C-alpha cells in the first residue's frame, strides 16, 4: 500500500545514510591539515565592462578565454572582448527577462533565456553579419534558470518546472527529459567530459544526471535552503554548491557525500554564483553582500575577497585557461579580476 | 595609438554599439513598466481588455506616455526566485475581485498575496495601484449576502458604500511601509472606461514622488 511504499522509501534512505556514514572514515579537513596554506591572494579589477543599463543576470566565458557573453534585464546580450573591452555583438532580445546565457564551446552559438520559458539560440558566425535566432526551443513550463551547451546541436536547460531537459537544436525537440527534483532547478553544471551533469534545485538537493540513459545516478543533500549555484570540480569527480544558507558545500561523486562546508559567521547573505579556479584549489563564490569571496577548496579558510561591486554579484565565471575571473553584478558592470 | 587598422575599426564598431545601446536605454527610460500581479485569475483579463508563456507583455499608450505591463501570474513557479527581476518597476497593479467574498475565502487568498507583495523586500518603494474589480457583482451580491462571511468583524451595515470602504481600509492596513509607498485604490468594473486615466494619474504621481525623492526635495 501507500504506507508501506513510504516505509520502504524511508528505510532505503536510512540504508543510504548508513552506507554514507560507513564510508565516511576521515574528513577532508583532517587530510588537508598538513598541506601548506593557500596564502593571502589579492586580485585587482583588470577590466570594467560598461554599457549595460540594467542588472546583469548571467554571463559565460567562451572557450577561447577571451570572448564572453553577458545577459541583462535591459534585453541586451553583449559579447565582450575582455582584452580590449570592445563590444563585438549586441543581440536584441525578444524578451527582456533573461536569467541565463551560455557561450557554445565552438563559439558559433549563444543561448539566453529567462521568464519567457525559452532560451533561444543565436547564430553568431553567420553570413549577413547579423546575429539571428537559430532556434527558439520551447517546451518548458517555467523560467529557464540555466541552459548550457554540450555540442553545437545539444543543449541542456534547467527550468523552474522542477525539470531539466536536453534539447536537439536542429529538430527543436526535447531528446531526454530529466525528472526527479521536487523544487525549481536554479543552477546546472556540465562535466568537463560532458557525459553527466549535476543540477541544484530549491529542494535543498543536487542530483547527478546521466545525459545518455536519462536517469539520475546520485542525489546529494545537506543544504538547509535553495541552491542557487553549482559548479563541477576541474577533475570531474567533485562539485560545489552554493545556497541561501550562506554556505558553500563541496560534494564528491565516487564517495557520495559532502567533503567540506564553506561558511563563515560574518556572512549571512546568500550565494548566487559559484565557480572553481583552474586546478580547483580556489572556490570563488558570489555572495549577496556585494562581495565575491574567494575560498580554498582543500581548507575552508578564506583566501581573499573581491570587493569591487555595488550590488549583488549574480554571475561569476573563471576562464578556461584560468587566467581571469569575471564577476557580474546588478550594478550594470562586469569586472574582470586577475 | 599602438592599434592596427582592424583594432581601430573594431573600436569604432564598439562605439557604434555603445551609441545604439544608449539610444535603446533612453527609449526604455521613457518607458513606464508596470507589474500586473492579480490574485488568482479574477480581474486580470477584464483590466487588460479595458486598457487596450511565462510573461504576457502588454504595451499601450495614453496621453503620449508609453506603458508596458507584465502578466506574470501564468508563471506557476516559486515567486521568490524571479520576483527580484521586477525590482525597480514603476508600480504594481493589483487586481482584487469583490464578488469572491462568498466564493479559504478568495478575498483572504488575495489578502495573503497582498501581504506577500506589498511587504516584499524588493518592493519597499514600489507603489501599488490596487484595482478592486467586479463592482456590479458586489453590489448585486451584498444585498443578499453580508460581508460577515469573509470578515468576521464588521460593524458597518449592509449598504454597499460602507462595505466597499471597509474592504479598501482593510487592504490599506495590509501594508507596513506606510511612509515609503502609497496604495492607490480604484473601484472599477467591466463597464468602466476611466481605468486608463486612473493608471496614468497614479503612475504620474509615482514618477513625481520618485523624482522628488531623487532631486532631494522630499
Amino acid at each position, epitope marked *: 500500500e501507500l504506507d508501506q511504499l513510504r516505509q520502504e522509501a524511508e528505510q532505503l534512505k536510512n540504508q543510504i545514510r548508513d552506507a554514507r556514514k560507513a564510508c565516511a572514515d576521515a574528513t577532508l579537513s583532517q587530510i588537508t591539515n598538513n598541506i601548506d596554506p593557500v596564502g593571502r591572494i589579492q586580485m585587482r579589477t583588470r577590466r570594467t565592462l560598461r554599457g549595460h543599463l540594467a542588472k546583469i543576470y548571467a554571463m559565460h566565458w567562451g572557450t577561447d578565454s577571451r570572448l564572453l557573453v553577458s545577459a541583462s534585464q535591459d534585453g541586451k546580450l553583449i559579447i565582450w572582448d575582455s582584452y580590449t573591452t570592445n563590444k563585438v555583438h549586441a543581440i536584441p532580445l525578444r524578451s527582456s527577462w533573461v536569467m541565463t546565457c551560455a557561450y557554445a564551446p565552438s563559439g558559433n552559438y549563444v543561448a539566453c533565456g529567462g521568464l519567457d520559458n525559452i532560451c533561444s539560440i543565436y547564430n553568431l558566425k553567420t553570413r*549577413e553579419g547579423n546575429v539571428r535566432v537559430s532556434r527558439e526551443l520551447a517546451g518548458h513550463t517555467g523560467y529557464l534558470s540555466c541552459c548550457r551547451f554540450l555540442d553545437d546541436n545539444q543543449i541542456v536547460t534547467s527550468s523552474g518546472d522542477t525539470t531539466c531537459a536536453l534539447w536537439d537544436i536542429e529538430t527543436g525537440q526535447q531528446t531526454t527529459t530529466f525528472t526527479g527534483h521536487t523544487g525549481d532547478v536554479m543552477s546546472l553544471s556540465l562535466a568537463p567530459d560532458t557525459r553527466l551533469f549535476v543540477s541544484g534545485a530549491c529542494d535543498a538537493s543536487a542530483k547527478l544526471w546521466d545525459v545518455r540513459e536519462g536517469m539520475c545516478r546520485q542525489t546529494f543533500t545537506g543544504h538547509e535552503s535553495d541552491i542557487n549555484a553549482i559548479c563541477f570540480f576541474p577533475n570531474g569527480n567533485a562539485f560545489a554548491t552554493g545556497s541561501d544558507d550562506a554556505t558553500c558545500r563541496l560534494f564528491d561523486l565516487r564517495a557520495d557525500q559532502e567533503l567540506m562546508t564553506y561558511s563563515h559567521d560574518n556572512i549571512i547573505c546568500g550565494i548566487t554564483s559559484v565557480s572553481f579556479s583552474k586546478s580547483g584549489r580556489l572556490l570563488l563564490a558570489g555572495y549577496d553582500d556585494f562581495n565575491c569571496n574567494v575560498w580554498d577548496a582543500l581548507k575552508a579558510d578564506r583566501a581573499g575577497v573581491l570587493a569591487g561591486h555595488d550590488n549583488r554579484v549574480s554571475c561569476l565565471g573563471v576562464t578556461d585557461d584560468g587566467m581571469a575571473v569575471a564577476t557580474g553584478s546588478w550594478d550594470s558592470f562586469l569586472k574582470i579580476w586577475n | 595609438c599602438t592599434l592596427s587598422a*582592424e583594432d581601430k575599426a573594431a573600436v569604432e564598431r564598439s562605439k*557604434m554599439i555603445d551609441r545604439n545601446l544608449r539610444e535603446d536605454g533612453e527609449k526604455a527610460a521613457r518607458e513606464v513598466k508596470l507589474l500586473l500581479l492579480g490574485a488568482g485569475e479574477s480581474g486580470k483579463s477584464t483590466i487588460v481588455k479595458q486598457m487596450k508563456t511565462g510573461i504576457v507583455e502588454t504595451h499601450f499608450t495614453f496621453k503620449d506616455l508609453h506603458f508596458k505591463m507584465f502578466d506574470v501570474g501564468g508563471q506557476r513557479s516559486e515567486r521568490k526566485k524571479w520576483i527580484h527581476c521586477f525590482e525597480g518597476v514603476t508600480a504594481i497593479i493589483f487586481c482584487v475581485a469583490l464578488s469572491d467574498y462568498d466564493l479559504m475565502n478568495r478575498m483572504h487568498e488575495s489578502m495573503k498575496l497582498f501581504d506577500s507583495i506589498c511587504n516584499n523586500k524588493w518592493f519597499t518603494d514600489t507603489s501599488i495601484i490596487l484595482f478592486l474589480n467586479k463592482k456590479d457583482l458586489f453590489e448585486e451580491k451584498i444585498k443578499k449576502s453580508p460581508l460577515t462571511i469573509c470578515y468576521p468583524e464588521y460593524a458597518g451595515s449592509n449598504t454597499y458604500e460602507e462595505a466597499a470602504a471597509y474592504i479598501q481600509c482593510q487592504f490599506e492596513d495590509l501594508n507596513k511601509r506606510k511612509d515609503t509607498k502609497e496604495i492607490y485604490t480604484h473601484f472599477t468594473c467591466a463597464t468602466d472606461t476611466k481605468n486608463v486615466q486612473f493608471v496614468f494619474d497614479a503612475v504620474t504621481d509615482v514618477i513625481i514622488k520618485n523624482n522628488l525623492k531623487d532631486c532631494g526635495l522630499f
Partner: single-chain antibody
Amino acid sequence: VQLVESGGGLVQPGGSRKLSCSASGFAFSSFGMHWVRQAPEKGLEWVAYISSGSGTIYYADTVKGRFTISRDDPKNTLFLQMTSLRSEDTAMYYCVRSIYYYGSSPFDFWGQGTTLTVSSSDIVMTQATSSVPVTPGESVSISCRSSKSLLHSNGNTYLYWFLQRPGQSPQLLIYRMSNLASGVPDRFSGSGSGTAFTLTISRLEAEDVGVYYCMQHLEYPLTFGAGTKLEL
C-alpha cells in the same frame, strides 16, 4: 548575398562619373565597405573605404582629393563619385565588404565589378613568382614577401590571400595569415613569419586555377601584390 554594381563605360578624360554598388542579402549598415580597383591587365589596387556609420573614410594617395566615397545605409547602396578622371583610372572597380571585430573575416565578398574605360611610406608586397606551371593533383607554394613586418603587437599577422578565377570576382581564401575563409575547402593553408609568407594548396584541382593576391591590412594604404597565375 549579392553586391551588384553600376556605372562605368566610356568617359572622356577630365570628366566625372559616379559608381553605385547596390547591396542586398546582408546587413549593409554594419559592414564597412571598400572599393578595389583592377587595371585591365595589372593587379588589384585599393581606392577608398567607408566605415560603418560613415565614421572614418580613407583614400589611396592616387585618388585622394579627387574621389569622394559615400554610402546611403537606408537605401543599401555605395557611392564612389570621382571628378577629373585621368587615363590611369581605367579599370574594373570592385565593391568589397568587410566587417571588423574579433574573429571577423574582412574582404569576404567581392562584387562582380563595373568596367570604366577613360578615353585616351607604403608596405609594398612582392610576389616574385609571376607565373608557375602546375599539374592537377600536385602541391604548390605561392610566396609573398612584405617590406615591413606585418605582425602587430596584438599577435595577429595581418595578411590576406585572395583568388581571382578567370573571368570572376576575387574570393577570400585565408585571412590573418592562417584562417580559412568560410566555404573555402580545407586544402588551402597559409603560413608566415612576419616578413615572408606562403600559401600551400594540396591536391590542386581545376577550380584552383587563377591568380593569387596577398593583401596587407596593418596600415591603411592597403597594398596588394602582383598576382601569381597558376596555369596548367
